[PDB]
Amino acid sequence: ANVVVRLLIRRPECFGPALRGEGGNGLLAAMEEAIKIAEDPSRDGPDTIHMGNAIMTFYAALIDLLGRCAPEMHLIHAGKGEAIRIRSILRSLIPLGDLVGVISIAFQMPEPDMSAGFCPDHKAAMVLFLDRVYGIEVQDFLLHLLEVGFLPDLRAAASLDTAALSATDMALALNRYLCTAVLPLLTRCAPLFAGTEHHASLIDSLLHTVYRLSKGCSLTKAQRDSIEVCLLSICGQLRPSMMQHLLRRLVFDVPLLNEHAKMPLKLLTNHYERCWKYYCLPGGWGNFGAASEEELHLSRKLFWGIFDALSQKKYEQELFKLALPCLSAVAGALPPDYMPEKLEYFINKYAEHSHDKWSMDKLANGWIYGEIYSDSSKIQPLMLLSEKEKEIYRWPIKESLKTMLAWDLHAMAEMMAENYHNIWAKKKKLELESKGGGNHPLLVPYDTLTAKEKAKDREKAQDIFKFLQISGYVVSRGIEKRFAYSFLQQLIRYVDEAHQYILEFDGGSRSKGEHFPYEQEIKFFAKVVLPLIDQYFKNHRLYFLSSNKEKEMVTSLFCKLGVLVRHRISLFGNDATSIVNCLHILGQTLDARTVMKTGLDSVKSALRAFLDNAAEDLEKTMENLKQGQFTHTRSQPKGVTQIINYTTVALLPMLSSLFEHIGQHQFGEDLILEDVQVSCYRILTSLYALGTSKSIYVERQRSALGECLAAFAGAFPIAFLETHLDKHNVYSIYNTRSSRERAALSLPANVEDVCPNIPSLEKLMTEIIELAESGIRYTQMPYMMEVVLPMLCSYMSRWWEHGPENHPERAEMCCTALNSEHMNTLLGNILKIIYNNLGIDEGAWMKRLAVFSQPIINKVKPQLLKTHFLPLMEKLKK
């Protein structure tokens, strides 16, 4: 490149005569003269060679050579001063304005036309030179280039889109040059034109023209990919408010779910995920603004359109996996709480007021009364427009009134302006067809066109609507619980339908080689709707503590899903984890206080029944594991295996999440009472016995067993291990319920008999002291070092919050005897055990013990430091 540049600068005779300084004609004038050569047969004088085409190709080749011999890349140019000299020489060689002119020289849309004239390869050469040599950085420069020549080529592409017009080789070649010109924007200056809006007209014109291009026919796969990347970049870093028209177009086009729908699906996905606050938060995306009511309505319409369209659509792995992020993004963006004679008199009054306005304007300009309406002498008979002009301009007013009567005020004015623009475009298209001429770019609608042309009609529409509201005529087109209730109601109908499909599929015998349509619907649900609900409860207020009936529907859906998982977990072979995660988030978002108050009584009783079913499954698992039937047991019945798998996998962590949420939000005192208390004691006994059992599968699933038991202990507001102290507690089931009522509820007259298997609280004291003395370890006695030491830790945390030291006034009322001294004793036992563990390489459980004791580290006396904290950390230092 260096030597080529040296030779060219030493001998400018290699260049075109126009480029040489001897003539100084200029590159743009050279191409204009080449066009003239092409037009003039004598200029293109006597397989044949077009003389102007030869000149033009020569100049394009020279420009391409200079652009390619320019400095390679920006850092090379910056570091190499010689590269700076070369770039300066090329800049002085070729003016920038000449490049803009040549890139603006447009083509002739063909009825074939012969390839003679300016060509897309010529434009590609000039744009390559402009991009490489001069650089394309300044924002106003980008906008000026976009408006000059760049957008016109896109308009030509929009024209050429049609089948025969694409059959034109001009369309084909222009597609190539169009890729070579569209890749620039994004790669070089995606951020800038998307960071400014100085020509918002140009912005919208670019967006919808590129979109119409993307709705092409003969475009190659790579071409379509390039267009899609361009659109995604521009949208994903352009202002949300300034492509709302494009939002509209995608809103109509996405529900088609055609092959072309993939690109808009990505577009909306990125748009909503990007500016999520803009469509949800009250202030939106900060200075970017917030989604107007119209934008929210369009987003909701698109949301339900895609929802129903995917519901009706046959399940496709690729298409639905691509569409799921879009629907999730729109759900996240949508706020959870989002919701004649008079006209003739108006015409007369507007005519009078307009006559007054014309008189005032003409006298302000300096008009005089006269028969002629010519503006050369400033004479008017309507004191520019004459009486005939006024009476003919009366007609469009009546036409607009009739149109919008057959169909707020500003929106209707915009609609009327679009209607008048469309009718004018139709009239001019008819005139062009009659005259046998080419179609002007103005034929495309207002949205496809720039915003500047809209303003001309918008001013008239605003004026006529101001006159209408002055006259006194208003014309148009003609709960926050409901938002969630609608989309959650789609979910509940989905779940009821899925229940029906599973019941029918189980009732009917399976056919080998024939897949059930019900099973297909189940798969579609579990692969589309099932992931969607968790994304719903994420980033949405559905428990309305930040819609009580919304909370009720959430609880009822939880009950239905829990029943479905309990009965037919085996059917969800691959979506079991997804549905269990949805159960977790349902418990996290569940308001048990609302389950108790302002919650449908049948729904809350169904929740009690589901918890009782969980207790029954836990009891069955108890019996199976005691008998020796588990996963490791080969001789295990199918139903028993299903019960054990369901319990250990799903039921433990799910109930763990529910009880953790209940304990965190103090929901135990409201949801858990009476029969719920009895069933919770049953669950407690089941979990205790399952943990006590020393089966290998129990050991494998020990973490979830303990996690659930601790969650239950925390959530519960009443005493169930204070065997000889439950009488003091006011909340006690023995204090509230009578002996006969407890007997009916299947509870004896002694709390010791209620919980005989579990050691009493004092016996637990003695056992923990024995742990501290004997130095137990998870190797010898794992059951209560890493499984139940957390249990007694959480137990004592709860009862330490409710104990006498925290409530000296209620010390007698506090059934528990756990104080700060017991708190220190338990923490010291934990650290004594940790010290016994210090010096082994199997203590993966110590970190777990740290987690268990983390809630109870900051509520101890300072006396424990010298006793235990120092020895452990000294040995750690060792």
């Binding site: 005032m360 006298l363 302000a364």
Partner: protein, 48 residues
């Protein structure tokens, strides 16, 4: 009346201050306004 739409040169309001008598008078496009003010001795008035 009518000068808001008929006057191409705009509105000119001329203020005259007679300091010997402390009198403020106003004229609108050559027409004397009925509104006038009387100020106290030793008062400093700022055009505003």
């Amino acid at each position: 009346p009518g000068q808001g739409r008929n006057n191409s040169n705009g509105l000119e309001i001329g203020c005259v201050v007679d300091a010997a008598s402390g009198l403020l008078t106003f004229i609108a496009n050559g027409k004397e306004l009925s509104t006038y003010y009387q100020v106290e001795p030793s008062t400093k008035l700022f055009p505003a």
